[model samples]
Target: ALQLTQSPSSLSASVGDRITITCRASQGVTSALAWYRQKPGSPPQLLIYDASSLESGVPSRFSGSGSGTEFTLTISTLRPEDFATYYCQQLHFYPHTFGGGTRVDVRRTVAAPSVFIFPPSDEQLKSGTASVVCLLNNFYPREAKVQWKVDNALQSGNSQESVTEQDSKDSTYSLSSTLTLSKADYEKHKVYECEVTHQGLSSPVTKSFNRGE
Candidate 1:
């Protein structure tokens, strides 16, 4: 088990104010740190990981730096939407641990409101022998499992995709899985899901898609 402690448990910064938080691990766990933000009514979103790499599709203003037991999460130009609770976690070990979290508020006095954002829902691919692809960004240690579900039934071994990693030590890695199905096997408005699980995480995260809905 790993322990994470966050500094200044909460904070307040005006729009454009450069905000920073530090995450310290109980033991040395070099470059495996990750940052996440949660807003009201939405799932947690990945911001930074492996010390300096930004997750895909994330804003340019958000960046991370530092290594070893100490790490920093920095937002270069805080936007109104960036006001929320930020957390850091270490994925280097089993049962990943998240930092206490630092709440960013509009004013230095008022408590920051909760925040959240949902990932993109599954989109329909081409018909007839269609394939589904799961894109996982910013994964460290390069270990994760991807599964495909159709109409609530778990499908096995349609085809397994490969995991790829960038050469740079600071660059985050990605993995993908593909599922193939004949056109007749898939019905209009049918539901499909992609579930991903990694070591140290308690529960798997899933995304769903409904055809013709």
Candidate 2:
């Protein structure tokens, strides 16, 4: 199966700020690729196909370039309606693969996000595992780092980070991450911590989750 890697996982921009997103394929796929953009709660809309061909009805400001193993999607001038996640896909392989995605959001000046960690639900805990949720809201610059720690040691695996969403009127951002722990592990661990570092914040934000607390 072919693989694709997209860069600038997330971006913050102002209207009229031109930007480009890179997509690289594991192996050369020539011009057999497509670009797509997706908005929150909406399906992906095609933008470019055949590597550089603009899809019908796509805005003139949107363009694609490159061939072989590397490709790029460019927005010449960003518009308010253009903030969305962009993805690239390889069309030459039997099982097409998509890029991780690049989310474009309106930029705000030095706004810090509010962070929260929610304990696992009863239904999930009953299934032998607990899913913990970490949420960040109203941040700026669209960049953040999230980590889960158990007893002050960094833990990995069985975690998912969601794409950030930007508010249309205020240009603030929101996103969530989830970590799964076996019910047994949850009982053994006295505390769980979610750590978040963002460009807009002066220091890291931390939230804790404890049973019966």
Best by TM-score: 2
lDDT for residue 110 in candidate 2, whole number 0-100? 74
lDDT per residue for candidate 1 within 84-173, as digits (tens), equals 789998988777888999877555321111111122223533434566667766554344777778888898968577755332443334
Off by over 4 Å in 2: 114-137, 142-164, 174-196, 205-213
Task: State the number of backbone clashes in model 1.
Answer: 7
Per-residue accuracy of model 2 over 43-134 as CA lDDT, tens digit each = 99999999999999998999999999989999998998888899999988868899999988777787777899998888888899988889
Return the TM-score for each candidate structure.
0.50, 0.70
